[PDB]
Amino acid sequence: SSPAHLTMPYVMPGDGEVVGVGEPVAIRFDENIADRGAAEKAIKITTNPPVEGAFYWLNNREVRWRPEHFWKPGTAVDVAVNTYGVDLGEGMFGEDNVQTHFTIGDEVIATADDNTKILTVRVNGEVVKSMPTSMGKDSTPTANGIYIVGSRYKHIIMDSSTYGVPVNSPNGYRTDVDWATQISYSGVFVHSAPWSVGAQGHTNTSHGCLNVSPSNAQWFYDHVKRGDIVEVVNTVGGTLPGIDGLGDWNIPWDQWRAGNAKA
């Protein structure tokens, strides 16, 4: 198989998953797609209850599809990527078809307000939990906007070595973190921060992550799922880029729906 001439699609969420109301459909190709319009035409997304949605490309290989507003809980989504033998541009053909079926679970929206420094978790519109947080310092602030819950980790190592920065160096690090819920590809997590417990709810002290107590971070880890939402408001930061990877909802609908198949 030639990487220039054959490409395989991969769809997320996986088959049979239950995801949050912020989860887009993601179709990722293992090669660059020259004809984005062809790829979009080959993908059929069925929703029940039916809802309008549209495609937007985050990069040369990954397209996302979502509705204008957060999904309605209980919605069933069927995705048919019918790319087998389809010309995806410049002598590049789809290698296979892929399918997924998934459903949307409860609406879970956690709001962090820099005025109160509380992260308030709402489930189907009802407050179920409040937790003190310490967000990014004025000089390294947490960006405002809408974040989608991604991967979670009971334990994770943030290692500078991965970026070529040696651990034993001024900017180097090899850091152990518990109960880490990823909310941006750029590396924003909700996580256990035993080191900032006294500041949580009061003063911002972090590098941009949402520091919470060990117990509250375990709670968060236990009670969220992929596609749930974290909203950050009133920080001195900018807005999370729409093309972060988990920042899809920061792109206004009129921009999203116009797409970038020809842009």
From Swiss-Prot:
The record marks C209 as: Binds to carbapenem drug (covalent). The lineage of its organism: Bacteria, Bacillati, Actinomycetota, Actinomycetes, Mycobacteriales. Ca(2+) binds at D87, E90, G91. It comes from Mycobacterium tuberculosis (strain CDC 1551 / Oshkosh). This is L,D-transpeptidase 2. It is a lipid-anchor. The gene is ldtB. GO terms for cellular component: extracellular region; peptidoglycan-based cell wall; plasma membrane. It is an enzyme of class 2 (transferase). It is found in: Cell membrane. It comes from the Bacteria. Its EC number is 2.3.2.-. Its main location: membrane. GO terms for biological process: cell wall organization; peptidoglycan metabolic process; peptidoglycan-based cell wall biogenesis; peptidoglycan-protein cross-linking; regulation of cell shape. Monomer. Pathway: Cell wall biogenesis; peptidoglycan biosynthesis.
